[PDB]
Amino acid sequence: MENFQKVEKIGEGTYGVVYKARNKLTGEVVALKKIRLGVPSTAIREISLLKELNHPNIVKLLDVIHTENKLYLVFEFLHQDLKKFMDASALTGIPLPLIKSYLFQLLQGLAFCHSHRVLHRDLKPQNLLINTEGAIKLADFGLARAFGVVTLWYRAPEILLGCKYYSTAVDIWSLGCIFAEMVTRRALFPGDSEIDQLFRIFRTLGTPDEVVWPGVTSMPDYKPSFPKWARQDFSKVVPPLDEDGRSLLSQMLHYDPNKRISAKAALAHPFFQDVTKPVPHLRL
Ligand SMILES: C[C@@H](O)[C@@H](C)Oc1nc(Nc2ccc([S@](=N)(=O)C3CC3)cc2)ncc1C(F)(F)F
């Protein structure tokens, strides 16, 4: 930490504060994450795992600094998060080819994490990072299980209904909501509490039953008393997404995590037949 000059705070989350910083020796510009708390021996090994987990679409973890009984993670710096890019692109929308590129690339990262049994668990526009060359990368995970107002908007229903051992399918759910948001320019499920989140999901997708989701009615926080809403058609939920986009989105948004599409199969969905890598117009 002596080795870095902080340039500016660029974020804050569950696990710490993030600064853009410069290596005082070598002039490298990095993102420096100070982990909020001795460090436990099992976060140390979980972090060692992450350092090896490298992929073009995963933010690179450069160095792990466990000194004076604090933890710092030194990451490559990316110049913009997708939340800011979405906000900046609100008048016209992000062009479809660019949405499709990003969704393709994020599935590719997720496919890689998931083959390694690593889950993100908290995907959101603020955790997705872009560059001037047209890449997008997932950031700020492995953190979730390594260590043990929060946004709920991208939370899978199994998590809101009290499932303790959830699967990679929670990340596909999240990425689904995000896809929809890029296309409509509105948040799909903008909840402000756990039950508001769950009921906004229930009014759009319909209240889940044993028919759409076997097991649902015995989950910890399921209540027979939940209201009964009817599902809406995706034609109403995500115009102007074409039928291929909607076909894919419905598969990412299946109630039953085991029916929900995997990242690897999503990469083969007909939606990505004509995928290309456009260059975004970034104002930095
Ligand atoms: C994942 C999450 O924590 C962001 C803050 O983290 C990271 N962020 C970046 N770059 C970054 C750059 C610009 C912006 S900005 N808000 O669009 C603009 C100043 C307003 C945001 C983030 N680079 C690496 C990381 C990471 F640490 F994850 F490696």
Q: Which of 6, 18, 147 to mutate to test the pocket of ligand 1 (most atoms within 8 A of CB)?
A: 18
Q: Are residues 244 and 122 in the same domain?
A: yes
Cis peptide before 220 (omega within 30 of 0): no
Mapping DSSP to helix (H, G, I), strand (E, B) and coil, where does residue 261 land? coil
Alpha helices (runs of H) in 116-192, residue ranges in sequence order:
143-147, 157-160, 169-184
Element (H, E) at 138: strand 136-138
Rounded-to-integer distance, Cα 16 and Cα 32, Å: 10
The resolution in Å comes to 2.0
Rounded-to-integer distance, Cα 170 and Cα 196, Å: 19
- Report the domain count for the chain: 2
Closest to 100 (Cα-Cα) out of 237, 274, 251: 274
Q: What order do you get walking across the sheet with 80-81 strand by strand?
A: 80-81, 128-130, 136-138
Closest to 211 (Cα-Cα) out of 228, 195, 198: 228
Alpha helices (runs of H) in the chain, residue ranges in sequence order:
41-52, 82-88, 96-115, 143-147, 157-160, 169-184, 194-205, 234-237, 243-252, 263-266
Q: Are residues 54 and 180 in the same domain?
A: no
Element (H, E) at 81: strand 80-81
Q: Are residues 137 and 263 in the same domain?
A: yes
Mapping DSSP to helix (H, G, I), strand (E, B) and coil, where does residue 164 land? coil
Q: Which residues are annotated as a binding site?
A: 10-18, 33, 76-78, 81, 124-127, 140
The residue behind tokens 């319909």 is 206
Q: Which two tokens stand for residue 27?
A: 């002039």
Query: Is residue 188 within 8 Å of 177, Cβ to Cβ?
Result: yes
The residues, ordered by sequence, that sit 6+ positions from 233 with a Cβ below 8 Å of its Cβ are: none
Q: Are residues 144 and 255 in the same domain?
A: yes
Using the 3D structure, point to which of 79, 112, 138 is the last residue of a domain.
Answer: 79
DSSP annotation of 58: B
Residue 41: give its domain's CATH number.
Answer: 3.30.200.20
- Structure determination method: X-ray
Q: Which of 81, 82, 120 to mutate to test the pocket of ligand 1 (most atoms within 8 A of CB)?
A: 81
Q: Are residues 75 and 179 in the same domain?
A: no
Cα–Cα–Cα angle for 3, 59, 278, rounded to 5 degrees: 130
Is residue 81 exposed (0-12), middle (13-18) or buried (19+ Cβ within 10 Å)? buried
Using the 3D structure, point to which of 50, 79, 108 is the last residue of a domain.
Answer: 79
- The DSSP annotation for 116-134 comes to TT-------GGGEEE-TTS
Rounded-to-integer distance, Cα 219 and Cα 166, Å: 12
First to last CA, the chain: 27
Task: Count Cβ atoms below 10 Å from residue 21 Cβ, excluding itself.
Answer: 23
Using the 3D structure, point to which of 45, 79, 113 is the last residue of a domain.
Answer: 79
Q: Are residues 87 and 220 in the same domain?
A: yes
Rounded-to-integer distance, Cα 141 and Cα 160, Å: 19
Query: Is residue 190 within 8 Å of 154, Cβ to Cβ?
Result: no
Residue 238: give its domain's CATH number.
Answer: 1.10.510.10
Would the CB of 139 count as within 6 Å of ligand 1? yes
Domain that holds residue 71: 1-79
Give the number of the atom of ligand 1 that is nearest the alpha carbon of residue 128: 1
Nearest CA residue ID for atom 27, ligand 1 = 31
